[PDB]
């Protein structure tokens, strides 16, 4: 027992000496003081956060909302801030989301920035105009087999200032839903009972946000109209959980309430004075209605326009009366739709097949200059990639092709 006591005492004293040395070193060698963040010039009013923390979290701390999609981490890659003086570096998500796109001015993804030193940023005013709301559902009904028109009423009579093509983000809390509470009419009950779709159920236990595209042009006030497509399990593996957000929205009915974030922005129309060609499909009728209406109603422009929507039947087509209410008096607007395989109850007398074979054959095949036009498209992954292939084989530049991926 002469050596055991020595061993215990020496182990304890050595570990204690090492710990105390490290604490004494850190006590004098790590800064910890006042750290400011001065943005968009310098009205000295700034965000004073302590040196420990993260940038976009420090920004969001005081009424400044940047576009985030997965709570943080770097999946989407739209948290782009101007860094005039701060951390000078590039981090793994910068290589994947702001890939090379050389930024000499300095525009790094805010997620990866370190707030330890002092920060000097530049943030455009369009970030400062975003707001949260509490809206109530006016109606929720099918316009196609798996598309629903979620209309919300912005309170106070105040309305959202946005531009055609922008997107809100929808907030939903922890909850439970089941499919047998849905308002699917009798016109659309066929396919649901055929795959036994009503058996599915879901529940999420955390907060979630997914982005949705407004389907009304800005001059329509006090309303945010959205077209949602419910994301059920794919037919190959129907065991996996269904979509948790898209299923939540279908549960809502008139008299509920929903909460939304301010106007985010991308995929805007240009003013080149060129011909505009719109190709929509699926739940992509939302950005196309905002684009076609913003031009004919508010801007009153005389650019040559066109719209080509690709459905799967006549039952799948919606907004058909509104568009003909536009083309009838505005003679510089024309629109066509093309059913893939119409059921014999349709008796369709127009076009068939996919839209890239209907757009090319009827219109682009005999066109004087296909490259001079502007192409705005928004649809499923199968339609998006099939058209962009066709447009490139016609000599069109990726600067004339505006695409709106739905992030999936």
């Amino acid at each position: 027992m002469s050596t055991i006591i020595f061993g215990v005492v020496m182990f304890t004293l050595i570990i204690l000496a090492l710990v105390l040395v490290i604490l004494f070193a850190k006590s004098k060698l790590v800064p910890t003081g006042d750290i400011t963040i001065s943005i968009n010039g310098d009205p000295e009013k700034a965000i004073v956060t302590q040196p420990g923390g993260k940038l976009l979290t420090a920004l969001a701390g005081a009424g400044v909302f940047v576009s985030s999609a997965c709570g943080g981490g770097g999946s989407c890659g739209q948290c782009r801030v101007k860094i005039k003086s701060g951390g000078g570096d590039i981090l793994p998500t910068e290589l994947d989301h702001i890939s090379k796109g050389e930024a000499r001015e300095g525009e790094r993804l805010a997620c990866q920035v370190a707030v330890k030193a002092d920060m000097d940023l530049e943030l455009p005013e369009e970030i400062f105009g975003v707001k949260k709301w509490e809206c109530t559902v006016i109606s929720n009904d099918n316009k196609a087999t798996f598309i629903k028109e979620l209309k919300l009423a912005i309170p106070d009579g105040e309305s959202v200032p946005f531009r055609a093509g922008g997107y809100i983000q929808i907030e939903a809390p922890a909850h439970h839903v089941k499919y047998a509470d849905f308002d699917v009419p009798e016109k659309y009950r066929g396919d649901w009972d055929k795959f036994n779709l009503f058996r599915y159920e879901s529940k999420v236990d955390e907060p979630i946000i997914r982005a949705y595209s407004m389907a009304n042009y800005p001059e329509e006030f006090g309303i945010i109209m959205l077209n949602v497509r419910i994301a059920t399990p794919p037919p190959n593996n129907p065991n996996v959980p269904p979509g948790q957000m898209s299923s939540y929205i279908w549960s809502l009915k008139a008299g509920d309430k929903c909460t939304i974030s301010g106007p985010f922005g991308e995929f805007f129309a240009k003013d080149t004075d060129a011909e505009m060609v719109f190709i929509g499909g699926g739940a992509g009728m939302a950005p196309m209605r905002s684009h076609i209406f913003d031009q004919l109603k508010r801007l009153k422009s005389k650019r040559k326009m066109s719209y080509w929507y690709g459905a799967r039947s006549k039952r799948e087509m919606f907004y058909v009366e509104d568009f003909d209410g536009l083309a009838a008096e505005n003679d510089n607007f024309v629109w066509h739709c093309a059913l893939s395989d119409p059921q014999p109850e349709d008796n369709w007398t127009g076009y068939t097949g996919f839209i890239h074979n209907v757009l090319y054959e009827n219109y682009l095949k005999d066109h004087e200059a296909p490259e001079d036009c502007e192409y705005y498209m928004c649809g499923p992954p199968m339609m998006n990639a099939a058209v962009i292939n066709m447009l490139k084989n016609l000599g069109v530049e990726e600067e004339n092709i505006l695409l709106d991926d739905f992030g999936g």
């Binding site: 090379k100 050389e102 004087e368 001079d372 490139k392 084989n393 016609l394 000599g395 530049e397």
Partner: protein, 446 residues
């Protein structure tokens, strides 16, 4: 002076007699759309429209303001479009004598012209396309400006014409063009020439420089490397002597001067000589009756760097000042790779040909081997005089590394700068395309 010691003067038969003789009357010209790098046309005419000299044919989307006009009057006969609907040529059939006229000046007014006036007249006449910026060898923007403007008063290409023989017929237009180019720059104008004397200008910033040696030396790339090294923050403009004559004539008479003097030479040409011709003329009519019976290849430019002119490409390029013709070599020979070749040219010393000095070869379009991997035996170092590491740079181009290539010196180069490295490669690599891909990636990323 500057003396180039690393290079190669190609021994090839059919060198021309430097005497300017008249040429056939051309019946159709064309604008080759695929020689302007990064150019996406916006067509202003359709098939069947009649046009005038210096009337816009198309425009550039990626470069706003730049106009592409017609070399002659006449009438559009055809527009050739190829894979993925790309523009190949806009062919005009010569007719009528209508043109567009501009302002005229005197020879003493030219040095005091305004730079924006000069720019507007050049862009309107469509003579702005004669310029090219290093790096990326593109047509300059309408708002940009350069400190170094290089005049190519020499040519060391194989079977090429001597500039002085042509400049001594247009001395005064050459001087007027040099004065306009002295007024158009914010720095200096470098007239890169050989030892012989040329018509000279009395302006301060215009200055002459002399180069001697084999051919890497008649290229604007070596001139820039040795007088005004280029980078991303320094850009130089390049032009040749015939375009300077064109500028002088435009500013001296108010009309466009669309003539050329090309050299019709090659191992199969019956009478190689200097031929007067029009810009963008038809090579299949220019070489009519001046070739030997057999299967030949017609080229617009050098055999080191040119454009095989067949079908919709059988027209003289914009930056080309000669036509080369040579046979097509499709013969197979027993153990030809192992035979002692007395009539075989090489940079190495493996064959018996180098033992006979002064021998000229009847070369053809044969690839003397198959495509293999790069084994460096030191041939690239023998034919490149610039201060670079050719093997490492060419392996960076082969592998597809753009960032390393830029550090190794890709931004100084052009396709004409690696034509000789492509020439002497045992693995039969083509380095012009690899460097164009590297420069495309660079210009896109930034």
């Amino acid at each position: 002076m500057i003396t180039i010691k690393k290079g190669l003067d190609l021994p090839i038969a059919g060198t021309p007699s430097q005497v300017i003789s008249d040429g056939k009357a051309i019946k159709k010209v064309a604008l080759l759309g695929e020689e302007y790098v990064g150019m996406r046309p916006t067509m202003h005419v359709r098939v069947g429209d009649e046009v005038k000299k210096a009337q816009i044919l198309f425009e550039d989307k990626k470069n706003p303001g730049v106009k592409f006009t017609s070399p002659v009057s006449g009438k559009v006969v055809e527009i050739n479009r190829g894979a993925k609907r790309v523009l190949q040529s806009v062919v005009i059939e010569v007719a009528g004598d209508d043109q567009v006229t501009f302002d005229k000046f005197e020879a003493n007014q030219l040095a005091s012209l305004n730079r924006d006036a000069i720019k507007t007249q050049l862009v309107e006449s469509g003579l702005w396309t004669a310029f090219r910026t290093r790096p990326f060898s593109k047509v300059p923007a309408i708002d940009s400006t350069s400190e170094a403007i290089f005049v190519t008063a020499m040519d060391t290409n194989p079977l090429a014409a001597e500039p002085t023989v042509v400049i001594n017929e247009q001395s005064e237009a050459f001087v007027a063009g040099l004065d306009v180019l002295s007024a158009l720059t914010t720095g200096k104008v470098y007239v890169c020439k050989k030892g012989t004397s040329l018509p000279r200008s009395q302006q301060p910033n215009v200055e002459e420089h002399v180069f001697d040696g084999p051919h890497p030396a008649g290229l604007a790339g070596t001139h820039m490397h040795f007088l005004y090294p280029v980078s991303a923050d320094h850009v130089a403009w390049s032009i040749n002597y015939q375009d300077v004559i064109a500028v002088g004539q435009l500013f001296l008479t108010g009309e466009l001067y669309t003539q050329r003097v090309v050299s019709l030479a090659g191992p199969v040409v019956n009478k190689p000589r200097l031929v007067r011709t029009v810009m963008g003329a038809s090579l299949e009519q220019l070489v009519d009756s001046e070739i030997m019976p057999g299967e030949v290849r017609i080229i617009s430019g050098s055999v080191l760097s040119g454009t095989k002119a067949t079908g919709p490409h059988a027209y003289l390029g914009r930056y080309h000042l000669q036509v080369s013709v040579l046979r097509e070599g499709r013969d197979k020979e027993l153990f030809g790779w192992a035979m002692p070749g007395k009539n075989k040219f090489s940079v190495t010393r493996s064959f018996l040909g180098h033992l006979f000095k002064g021998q000229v070869y009847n070369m053809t379009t044969t690839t003397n081997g198959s495509d293999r991997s790069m084994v460096p035996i030191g041939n690239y170092e023998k034919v490149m005089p610039l201060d670079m590491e050719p093997t490492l740079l060419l392996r960076d181009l082969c592998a597809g590394d753009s960032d390393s290539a830029v550090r190794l010196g890709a931004l100084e180069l052009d396709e004409e700068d690696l034509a000789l490295c492509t020439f002497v490669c045992p693995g039969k690599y083509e380095y012009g395309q690899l460097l164009r891909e590297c420069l495309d990636k660079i210009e896109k990323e930034g």
